[PDB]
Amino acid sequence: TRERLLSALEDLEVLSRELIEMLAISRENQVLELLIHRDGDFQELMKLALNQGKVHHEMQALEKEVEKRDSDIQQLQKQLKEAEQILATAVYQAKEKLKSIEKARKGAISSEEIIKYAHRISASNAVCAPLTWVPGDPRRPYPTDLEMRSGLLGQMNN
């Protein structure tokens, strides 16, 4: 606290100046109080100087140590974060590939179902692949126009 020490020193100096002026104008308790204030100010100044040196040394040491530790920790954290991002991208690609492989292996078509579809579809153009059958060609899913729209679904089943 530089403010308190400066105030004490200024008060001691003012008391000393007043005592000197009184002694010069003349030819006790005031001088004793001024001397006690000056001694207390000197002791407080010495103690504050020692404490300030100690605090400066400790602040420099702690600043250097904390800067080194924080720089090391931040560098390690950034490196670990980049490595974890790379590993997470790799694991995400691997999980996507594994899900695709599972959907490819666990899912399959039935031979008997396809054989029955071919045996029952060889009558009309329902699920048969024509020669010029591109996406959006005249091939449709319905068996016929009159057999589906005007057939049993439209007449008997409405």
């Binding site: 080194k68 720089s71 090391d72 560098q75 390690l76 490196q79 670990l80 490595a83 790379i86 590993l87």
Partner: peptide
């Protein structure tokens, strides 16, 4: 997984950055 060894080098980089 071999790149993990590179991260292990970062651990060495953690040793050299401490001085």
């Amino acid at each position: 997984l071999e790149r993990v060894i590179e991260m292990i080098q970062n651990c060495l980089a953690s040793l050299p950055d401490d001085l």
